[PDB]
Amino acid sequence: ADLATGAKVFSANCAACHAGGINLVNAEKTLKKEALEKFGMNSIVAITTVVTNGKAGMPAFKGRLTDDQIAAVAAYVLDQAEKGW
């Protein structure tokens, strides 16, 4: 919502591990709505925090993405998950 920036950020930073509906190394490790919901991750604040910091080995993007870029990709992930990738 910046979805335009979000889509670009996703392509350049996230698709390498999450690309095209299902993740390359995963099944429910994709960004499907139901998977996000299990751990309360289906919100702008939750995705912003995990991408910035993130968690449990998932890489932190605080160095290489600005706060605005992270907010943008968070929007993109939520919108795509709602549409169904």
Assess 81 for contact with ligand HEC (CB under 6 A): no
Q: How far is the CB of 69 from ligand HEC (least distance, A)?
A: 8
Size of the site for ligand HEC (CB under 6 A): 19
**What is the chain's Cα-based Rg?**
12
Assess 42 for contact with ligand HEC (CB under 6 A): no
CA 17-46-26 angle, to 5 degrees, is 25
Give the one residue of 39, 53, 60, 67 binding ligand HEC; rule: CB under 6 A.
Answer: 39
Amino acid at the residue 1: A
